[PDB]
Amino acid sequence: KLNPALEFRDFIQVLKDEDDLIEITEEIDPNLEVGAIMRKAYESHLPAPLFKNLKGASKDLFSILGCPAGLRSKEKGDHGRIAHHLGLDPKTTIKEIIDYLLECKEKEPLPPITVPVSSAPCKTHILSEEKIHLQSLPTPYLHVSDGGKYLQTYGMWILQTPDKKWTNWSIAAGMVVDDKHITGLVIKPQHIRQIADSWAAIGKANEIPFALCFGVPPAAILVSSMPIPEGVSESDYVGAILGESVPVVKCETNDLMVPATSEMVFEGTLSLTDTHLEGPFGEMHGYVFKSQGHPCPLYTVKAMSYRDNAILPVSNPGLCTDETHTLIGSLVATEAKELAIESGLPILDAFMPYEAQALWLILKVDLKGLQALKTTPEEFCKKVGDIYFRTKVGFIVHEIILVADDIDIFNFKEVIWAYVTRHTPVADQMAFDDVTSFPLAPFVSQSSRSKTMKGGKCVTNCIFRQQYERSFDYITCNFEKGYPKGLVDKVNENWKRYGY
Amino acid sequence: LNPALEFRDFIQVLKDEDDLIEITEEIDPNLEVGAIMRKAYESHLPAPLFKNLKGASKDLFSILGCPAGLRSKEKGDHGRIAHHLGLDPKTTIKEIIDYLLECKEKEPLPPITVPVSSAPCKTHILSEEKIHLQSLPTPYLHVSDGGKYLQTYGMWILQTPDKKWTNWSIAAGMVVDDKHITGLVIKPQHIRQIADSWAAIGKANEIPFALCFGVPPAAILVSSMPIPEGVSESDYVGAILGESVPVVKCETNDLMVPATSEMVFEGTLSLTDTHLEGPFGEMHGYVFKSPCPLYTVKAMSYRDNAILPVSNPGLCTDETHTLIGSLVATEAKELAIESGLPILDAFMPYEAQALWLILKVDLKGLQALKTTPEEFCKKVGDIYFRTKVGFIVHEIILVADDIDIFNFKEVIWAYVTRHTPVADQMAFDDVTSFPLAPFVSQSSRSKTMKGGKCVTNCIFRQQYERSFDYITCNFEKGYPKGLVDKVNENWKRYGYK
Ligand SMILES: Cc1cc2c3c(c1C)C(C)(C)CC=[N+]3c1c([nH]c(=O)[nH]c1=O)N2C[C@H](O)[C@H](O)[C@H](O)COP(=O)(O)O
Ligand SMILES: Cc1cc2c3c(c1C)C(C)(C)CC=[N+]3c1c([nH]c(=O)[nH]c1=O)N2C[C@H](O)[C@H](O)[C@H](O)COP(=O)(O)O
Ligand SMILES: [K+]
Ligand SMILES: [Mn+2]
Ligand SMILES: [Mn+2]
Ligand SMILES: [Mn+2]
């Protein structure tokens, strides 16, 4: 019996059973080759590559699994890979996946369970400080012009507060610096930064304990990507999704708990006072820019542990569609739907289209609910923007687009139609000048707005004026919706006989 | 086969390409014609030729639908459009546009009168009391249309009182009763400009016209193109064809009609005698439940087994996008060259329902102007939105020369990643609005008819000044060609099926 949500290796096996994984046995260079193969597979929605013979590898360190949450063909279920991180039927839609995650918020949180070390495959091999050699690993060089090799693209950073009440799991990119050090972005408003600032506040900025875990339970890596509330430990919600506690063991060199079935675990201390230049790194909007960036904190690795024949999962970001659109975007959408429900807005669904590179959040609006409020477009846009852009859930989003409930927001052909035909350029767009800008957006990073970090965000009204007051019946001029059902069925029936 | 010159040769070349289905079973012109057309358009399928319409006579008529719809890439996807011009069927939309511009530099060839005996449009001739427009199997195209639309891919002919300008153009035309048709006749369209000349000398109620169906395909393409005022479209159609269009006189007035037209209607137009028109399903995808001039039909002439060509507008992609959009883009490129802007290409993406005009900028030419985003956006908007060529266009989008503007994947990528919402958009408040845009028609801007247009800057600030090298993070552009080729070569050996 396979349990893909609880075991990374069972997740591999079910993708094999669905012919959605290719074991590549010939020699592949971690320098560019891995990365280009991944981009080709993401962009035509093809099977996930599993590289078994990397140039420079040892028997144990490591294989690479690329594209762990890319899209695949509609026949097998196109979001199948996502659905298997949650233990759901491979044909489940992304609307359904979202509404499942919201149901699991109502279930009892189950905290992790400690198990004996001999039951943790992550403890099979252990390396102390003098045996750590990060430059000897077959780490990938993923994009032309990247500043280094990125070991950490699909692992889980684990940090805990000084008072021990909140342990955080999240994903952020991590670059190998030298034989013992990794560096990466630690920016507001992310929780990794909030926890580090709390270590600085009690005098320990140069010695923050961390763990970095690869090939965790798939449900854990997906909740690592999700912006749940401050103070809530990811592990307890992951337990609710699994229906059982995640099994964990303690680190060798600190008090943190790591999943027992991890492929690889790195441990150490993070310093906010000892910094290094990071990047460049190809990013979720499709670009490598040569900008040297701010200097970033340094992670010092002091121990590692791993399984026999260990597998590193990898994400290679860029043009749609990859994990930075299917996870970051759809998990912002999950929490955006939750926020509409708690603040009383009449939203049926939310979604971040892949074609818009996770910059556009579409809200599908219930028209009876909207009419009950007896409001105007100007007041509704302000209320919505104030809810979303002044909170952490809104951070990556630069344009919020409001459409009526006759639009399938999960179909980008319906969304681009409503966008160009139902909003007046400029006049139907409300600017928010004083809110936090998203620094990765290229129109921000490559402007003066990078110095100031405020504004450039908008709410765009694609709801007709009459739709705020009452019913408004119009015909949509295509085959499926423009003609009555009986005629559609008759044309579909006689299609062959006509001569097609 | 000369498909640019003969409508029946166009139908045959489509037969030879398996791009035409002769439908022989009985089909109702009430909704069924329309629905079949929509299904064909939307999956880029072969054009339906309806041979046995309920209510038809032997001669009046069949319907060809989807004459400038898209087809499979294997056959050439703009093949139908290339055939209107006599070009190879795999010619790209880029090459089609550039061909139309090269044809502006050839010598115009005015029409040539031929004998009435050699002219098929004269095979059958009806006099005034033999006109019965309600006995034609005219299509009822969209649910909630305000009536039956006979004129959707025919050619209106109007001439100035001095005889020096003959205009050919397309505009929708709805049957009102047994003798009368009504259509939109609006500024700034040449048909309104010419009608107003007749009103100015006291003949607003008796303007001669003709209406022709199944014209030479090159003529129906130019009829949809905004060429300059006072140029008779016939003369440029001649330059395109490499010969004069062959024409014959109308029975009841002095206008000349193409000799091979399937059907010709003749009469007088009145601007002061109005009737309710519409609603009609339109180029942006809607019928809304929301008073135009009257055309009096006084004579008709037609071929044996005549064929009415039909366009049914709606969602992308149909003739309102492949012709109206691309021919605005053709004239938009001509205006850039004439005004001196650094534009390599222009296109109106079909996905944006012909509301978006994308302009591909040459960065060395832009850098040579020593300008800013604010000043360039003003310069571009002032050229386009204040002239007839910019009439349908509500957003102009400026991109650099690394974007293929003919591929909508790269357009939407550039759009969302390279402009700051609002701050990088310049509103034009005092220019004329397109009254068909749904955001205009369903707001109080329907009554003012000004504003709601903008130029959106999608060129990075540094690209106005100098080189700017970044990597595009996909497979074919992100990696060296050698490595791209190596991966493609070994793809099957890895295990991909
Ligand atoms: C799935 C995923 C999420 C990335 C991500 C990537 C992936 C594959 C990469 C590694 C390919 C590239 C860039 N990533 C970063 C990122 N957030 C961040 O602060 N820095 C990052 O470097 N994220 C988002 C981050 O995981 C979410 O915002 C979480 O909500 C953070 O958790 P938190 O709410 O506990 O802070
Ligand atoms: C190809 C095509 C073009 C339509 C058109 C359609 C098609 C199929 C229809 C019939 C399906 C629906 C609506 N159309 C109208 C329209 N222009 C207009 O003034 N009224 C219209 O009703 N046009 C565009 C018109 O032909 C262009 O604006 C020309 O440039 C007009 O020529 P002009 O420069 O000589 O005035
Ligand atoms: K998280
Ligand atoms: Mn968190
Ligand atoms: Mn004209
Ligand atoms: Mn014309």
Residue numbers in the entry:
A (entry chain C): 3 to 502
B (entry chain D): 4 to 293, 297 to 503
From the paper:
The UbiD superfamily is composed of a wide variety of (de)carboxylases acting on aromatic, hetero-aromatic, and unsaturated aliphatic acids. Prenylated FMN consists of an FMN molecule modified by the addition of a fourth non-aromatic ring joined via N5–C1′ and C6–C3′ linkages between the flavin and prenyl moieties. In the UbiD enzyme family, Arg173, Glu277, and Glu282 (A. niger Fdc1 numbering) form a conserved ionic network.
The crystal structure of the R175A variant again shows prFMN in an unmodified form; here disruption of the ERE hydrogen bonding network has resulted in residue Glu285 moving away from the active site to within hydrogen-bonding distance (2.7 Å) of residue His287.
